[PDB]
Structure 1
Amino acid sequence: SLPGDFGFDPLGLLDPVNSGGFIEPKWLQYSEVIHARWAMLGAAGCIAPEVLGAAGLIPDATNIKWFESGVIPPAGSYNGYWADPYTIFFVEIVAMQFAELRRLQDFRYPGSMGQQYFLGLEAIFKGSGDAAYPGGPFFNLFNLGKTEAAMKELKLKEIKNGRLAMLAMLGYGAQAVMTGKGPFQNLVEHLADPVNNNILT
């Protein structure tokens, strides 16, 4: 019934007999998807400057590696920002508090977020019975997957780009600790001398 089912569970997690807590079918399909959606943001978001900068669109300052942005101060922090990294992290917490807890309240109560006023948006945030796939004019402006078949296939398309982008992030990290360079400088140096620029070296 879940999309991305190619039958891969050595560890009997999704087995619904005597389930409890966070080892719940409804729950994990959710995680994987939200995981997928974030992972694809990170994958395309980590590289883009290193690429676009090298491409010569982005100035000399901005064109940094992913771990040199000021997330991990000791690996490098940026300067040229609207503010310091901590006056940001607060603007983050308030926002992600709102926009993650709301999303939790659709999971917890389907109908909720539809009733209690929220600057006109309460009309929007009704849900879709299914949690992972809310839609409505906010989160599906183009009304794509107009049929049940075309939707199920788009749900197939989503999870696979995701799972790939999650491994890609497991990539960029495990890669950055051993190399100490960004996964686009690793790629171009690997085009130049495939056997010299390698794990084994």
Structure 2
Amino acid sequence: RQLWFASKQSLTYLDGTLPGDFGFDPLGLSDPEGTGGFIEPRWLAYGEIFNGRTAMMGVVGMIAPEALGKVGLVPPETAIPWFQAGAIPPAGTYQYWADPYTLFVFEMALIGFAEHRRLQDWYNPGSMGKQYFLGLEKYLGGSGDPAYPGGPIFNPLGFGTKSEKEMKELKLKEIKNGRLAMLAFLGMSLQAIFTGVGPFQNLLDHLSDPVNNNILTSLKFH
């Protein structure tokens, strides 16, 4: 257990009881005294895990269109940098099937169904297995931990069965591969601002000739 910037106050409530516990609270936001609203260890852990899980596929989906286009498997029209796909209108756009805004409502309906349905299990676990839901309510029961739902729907293949310590190791792997993705997202967000070129394209410039480094990219052109 490699403690990192652990303070005297933080060591009291940080005792390696949660996966990926290394003891880094240099501000004390996870202190158990005076809790209310959103600041709460269970909610903070859930939020960290969820932001990381989202950031995983966010970073993965922002690189494939450029590399796969370069290798010669996607038409050049589609293969464009991530920030030129319509999410940022002043930085290029593409003509999709319906609209930049009708797609937003279409997406928001489906995502809001899932989010409003997931929020209930956090409040009272197991409450989604009662009311009729076209026959899928007998599977949307839960496990007892909102962060790790499990079940046939969320685990069709039993990769986390017949062992206990292996589950802890998988949780620790998830924490690392989710913490890496958030920093990757931050990096690819800043790189596009300071360079204006696709992140995958920026890799080759440093890989081939490590001369155009950060100092040469400090003038902050358009």
Shorter-chain TM band:
over 0.9
**Residue 56 (structure 2) pairs with residue 40 (structure 1):** yes
1:102 matched residue in structure 2: 117
Give, in whole Å, the separation in 2 of the partners of 1:35 and 1:118.
28
Give, in whole Å, the separation in 2 of the partners of 1:77 and 1:2.
44
Q: How many residues of Structure 1 are paired with residues of Structure 2 in the alignment?
A: 199
Secondary structure at 2:160's aligned position in 1?
coil
> Identity over the aligned pairs, expressed in percent?
65
- Which one of the candidate residues 187, 193, 210 is aligned to 1:171? 187
Secondary structure at 1:61's aligned position in 2?
coil
Give, in whole Å, the separation in 2 of the partners of 1:189 and 1:83.
37
1:17 matched residue in structure 2: 33
- Which one of the candidate residues 88, 100, 105 is aligned to 1:85? 100
Compare 85-94 and 161-170 and name the one that shifted more: 85-94
- Which one of the candidate residues 114, 124, 128 is aligned to 2:139? 124
Which stretches of structure 1, 4 residues or more, deviate above 2 A after TM superposition? none
Secondary structure at 1:105's aligned position in 2?
helix
Stretches of structure 1 lacking an aligned partner (at least 5 in a row): none
1:112 matched residue in structure 2: 127
- Which one of the candidate residues 23, 38, 41 is aligned to 1:7? 23
What amino acid sits opposite 1:87 in the alignment? Answer: T
1:139 matched residue in structure 2: 154
Compare 26-35 and 9-18 and name the one that shifted more: 9-18
Stretches of structure 2 lacking an aligned partner (at least 5 in a row): 1-16, 217-222
- The normalised TM-score by structure 2 is 0.87
Pick 1 or 2: higher relative contact order, CA cutoff 8 A, min separation 6: 1
For the aligned residues, what is the CA RMSD?
Answer: 1.0
What amino acid sits opposite 2:128 in the alignment? Answer: M
1:35 deviates by 0.5
1:76 deviates by 1.1
Give, in whole Å, the separation in 2 of the partners of 1:36 and 1:121.
28
Give, in whole Å, the separation in 1 of the partners of 2:111 and 2:44.
20
